[PDB]
Write a protein that binds this DNA or RNA. Structure first.
Lengths: 165, 165, 97, 222
RNA sequence: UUAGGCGGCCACAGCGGUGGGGUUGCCUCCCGUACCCAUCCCGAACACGGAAGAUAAGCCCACCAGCGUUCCGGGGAGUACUGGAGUGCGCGAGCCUCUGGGAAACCCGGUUCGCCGCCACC
RNA sequence: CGGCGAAGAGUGCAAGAGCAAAAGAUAGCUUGACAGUGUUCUUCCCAACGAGGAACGCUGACGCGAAAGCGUGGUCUAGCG
RNA sequence: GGAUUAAGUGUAAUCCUCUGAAGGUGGUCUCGAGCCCUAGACAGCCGGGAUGUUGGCUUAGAAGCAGCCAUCAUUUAAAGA
RNA sequence: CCUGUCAAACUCCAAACUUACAGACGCCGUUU
């Protein structure tokens, strides 16, 4: 924190586990919520979660913003309705100033060449319109799930659109 | 008709694994004066904890057959130990020779087997033209029609010399 | 490291369908005197190969030395001389549009 | 087909006919009556039948000037099994003295011969009988020792055509002997293998085939 | 070639599947090891010798689209993206207009179960 | 012993690339890992610069093959003064 | 010619340079969407908010309105356990 | 079998575009 020089893509690939080790584990609980198995897809009421932005939310971003989300999805009696889906994973690894590579801004260090930033965190990135994490059930209430994501958004760097079913 | 009938192609006895004729070249002696020929084979799989870690292995294995040598052998062969001569014992293909198998990785291989029926006997049964499949050329495949059936297989041998049990 | 097989990656490589040996016909075909021939390296070749830089440009074949044909880009290198060194086999393709 | 992600190699391939990576082998040595896209003194084997061909390739073609295939023999000669070596010495020998010098044999054509002083006249060829040639490719097959494939080569060698090959990778004789060992030159057929199966209990006659060969080397019809 | 050999392009040719064909003309399967030759052991294969018997395999011929592939119609889509220009808009990120190009996924319907060259051949 | 089994078991060594009647395996034979002298490319894109390297010849002498032919070291790019 | 804005927003192409991201306004203009209306809407506006009975259970309480079960009947112009 | 995602050191695909050569138009050159 804060996430600033973290989620703007001004770099290019990898993740690559070959290349990198010492990746921190994600603190993003399972990306399968609600009752799985049965096809939730048969449902009235629909979806949400549209990013409306560019990218790279960190696992710190998604994992408390998503279960936060689920927490107020609990209202629908624990195990009784909806499945929650998350889309993208936090693959993508980021490195931060370890003074040896270059100079100035991050992904630059001291000297020239040298320490790339040391591994510290991972974040998935997204596009202008992608569905961050969706799923629904019949209109349980007015739309508790719609209330969900109200809270879900408001912990994402992006401005997420609710998007109607 | 006669074509359809089942006869035994190559059987071949075998011996257990480990070195053979340890004290002196022996164990080949058995298999000798039995079956008429004298095979020997070798093995792969270097580190054996209580086996060798020899690569090219002296490992005993042997025998084969023909027509009529394994008849007059496989005569006074079967009618040896068979608590249950047949049943579940052999399987779809026709004949087998086994005992109790162990959980081992099987199936994705040419399928030679450890299985020991007698000093692991290998009656293999095939009807037909079958020399088709084996022979190098347009190999062809067995029909999966004119294929042996365990029921048919637990026939023929049984009709002669010994009960199925 | 540095060497003939320098950064090539795709240019040299021939993939899936055309893998293995190639037909003899290409490397047997003869060209005579000034004939414009393109240069490339068909992969699946291991001889009569030019460098890597300069591959793709046409040159004019000239006389043959040993089993290989003087050709190569007789043509200019960059905006420059037709300084030419040619040691290419028929294996690399000939012809003109 | 498939997803077509793969490309399939076939031509002659797919179902087998020619090989490749062989039959390319043959070809380089330009042989045939004349320059050939692919040339051979093919030897094929069939159950109960042996065939000898011979001819340079065409773009579409793979023609054959003269053929053998014991089957036709006996045109003259005799009724016996054709699935043995003897009778696969005869042919490949009968083809020789057909392909081998009749329609034309090794590179002999009207007009000036290929560059090199070379003149061919009847009777023993001047400047060496060496120029006569064909390469014999067993098709898909297995090279063995004395094998009929080779045997096909043996006659259809002393038939005038001169093909490279390796001696000692032949049957010797006996299986297919020469009448007299001191003189290599002779038309010779033997079928010793089968013969002496029995001693001479009855049946097989090796003696008959020497008879055939006698006829072969001589002025015969086609 | 009412069945062959050598190829070119190298899945439009792949995978799977149905039907038909010969018996002495072909290809095989097939039959058999005296020989040339052969199996770290097996004439299995390779090699040789040969036709008692078959079309059942292969092969050749006709055909099927379920999968894979190729191309095409229509839709997606003149969308996504983009070369050139703009005292057009927007706090900005970015967007828009004019001009010249122009996709992929996927869906529905067709196409494709090879095409071609030389040679030999009832 | 039999059956299934296009390749998940190779090619000295990084990585990438090449290869199936082979460049891989096995067997046998053999010393071309030869002497001499070139052409060309590379080193050094374009664009001059050495050692080194490579491709491709010829002259001479050999090896193996029926023969075409292959062999100017080890499939190619590091292993040099 | 037309429309928006009431904040001096703004009168700032680009940028170290011109900030502003995930305070308020029934001032006014313009555009869209849902539902309700001449079987008369809003005000829509004005006025009123029945008996068994505090239904049974539960509970410290549970009286239309924590929760579970039931949701009848009466008197009605009408009024849900 | 259905279902949820990715790649600077992945690729069944695949641009715009850069590039060798040639012809054409243009432009240029033979008192510059």
């Amino acid at each position: 924190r804060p996430a600033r020089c973290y989620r703007y893509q001004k770099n290019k690939p990898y993740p690559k586990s070959r290349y990198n080790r010492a990746v921190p584990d994600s603190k993003i609980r399972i990306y399968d919520l609600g009752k799985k198995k049965a096809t939730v897809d048969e449902f009235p009421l629909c979806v949400h979660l549209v990013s409306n932005e560019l990218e790279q939310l960190s696992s710190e971003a998604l994992e408390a913003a998503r279960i936060c989300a689920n927490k107020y999805m609990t209202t629908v009696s624990g195990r009784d309705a909806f499945h929650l889906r998350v889309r993208v994973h936090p693959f993508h690894v980021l490195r931060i100033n370890k003074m040896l590579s270059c100079a100035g801004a991050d992904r630059l260090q001291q000297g020239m060449r040298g320490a790339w930033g040391k591994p510290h965190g991972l974040a998935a990135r997204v596009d202008i319109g992608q569905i961050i994490f969706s799923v629904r059930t019949k209109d349980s209430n007015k739309d508790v799930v719609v209330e969900g994501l109200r809270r879900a958004r408001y912990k994402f760097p992006g401005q997420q659109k609710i998007i109607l079913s | 008709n006669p074509m359809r009938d089942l006869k035994i192609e190559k059987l071949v006895l075998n011996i257990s694994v480990g070195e053979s004729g340890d004290r002196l070249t022996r164990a080949s002696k058995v298999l000798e004066q039995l079956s008429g020929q004298t095979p020997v084979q070798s093995k792969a799989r270097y580190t054996v904890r209580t086996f060798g870690i020899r690569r090219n292995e002296k490992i005993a294995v042997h025998v084969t057959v023909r027509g009529p040598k394994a008849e007059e052998i496989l005569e006074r062969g079967l009618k040896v130990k068979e608590y249950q001569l047949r049943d579940r014992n052999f399987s779809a293909t026709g004949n087998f020779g086994f005992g109790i198998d162990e959980h081992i990785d099987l199936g994705i291989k040419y399928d030679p087997s450890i299985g020991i029926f007698g000093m692991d006997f290998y009656v293999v049964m095939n009807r037909p033209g079958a020399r088709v499949t084996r022979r190098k050329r347009c190999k062809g495949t067995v029909g999966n029609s004119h294929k042996t059936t365990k029921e048919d297989t637990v026939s023929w041998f049984k009709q002669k010399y010994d009960a199925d049990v | 490291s540095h060497g003939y097989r320098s950064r090539t990656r795709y240019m040299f490589q021939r993939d899936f369908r055309k893998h293995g040996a190639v037909h003899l016909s290409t490397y047997l075909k003869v060209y005579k005197v000034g004939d414009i021939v393109d240069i490339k390296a068909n992969g699946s070749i291991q001889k009569g190969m030019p460098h890597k830089f300069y591959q793709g440009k046409t040159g004019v074949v000239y006389n043959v030395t040993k089993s290989s044909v003087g050709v190569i880009i007789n043509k200019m290198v960059g905006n420059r001389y037709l300084e030419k060194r040619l040691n290419l086999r028929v294996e690399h393709i000939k012809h003109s549009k | 087909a498939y997803s077509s992600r793969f490309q399939t190699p076939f031509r002659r391939r797919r179902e087998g006919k020619t090989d490749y990576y062989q039959r390319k082998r043959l070809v380089t040595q330009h042989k045939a009556k004349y320059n050939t896209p692919k040339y051979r003194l093919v030897v094929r084997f069939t159950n109960k039948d042996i065939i000898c061909q011979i001819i340079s390739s065409t773009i579409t073609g793979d023609v054959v000037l003269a053929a053998a295939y014991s089957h036709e023999l006996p045109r003259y000669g005799i009724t016996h099994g054709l699935t043995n070596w003897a009778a696969a010495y005869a042919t490949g020998l009968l083809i020789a003295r057909r392909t081998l010098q009749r329609l034309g044999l090794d590179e002999t054509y009207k007009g000036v011969e290929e560059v090199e002083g070379e003149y061919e006249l009847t009777e023993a060829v001047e400047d060496g009988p060496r120029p006569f040639k064909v390469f014999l490719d067993i098709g898909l097959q297995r090279t063995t020792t004395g094998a009929r494939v080779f045997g096909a080569l043996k006659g259809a060698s002393d038939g005038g055509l001169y093909v490279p090959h390796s001696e000692n990778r032949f049957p010797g004789w006996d299986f297919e002997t020469e009448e007299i060992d001191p003189e290599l030159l002779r038309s010779y057929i033997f079928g010793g293998h089968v013969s002496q199966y029995m001693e001479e209990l009855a049946d097989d006659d090796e003696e008959r085939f020497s008879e055939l060969f006698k006829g072969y080397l001589a002025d015969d019809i086609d």
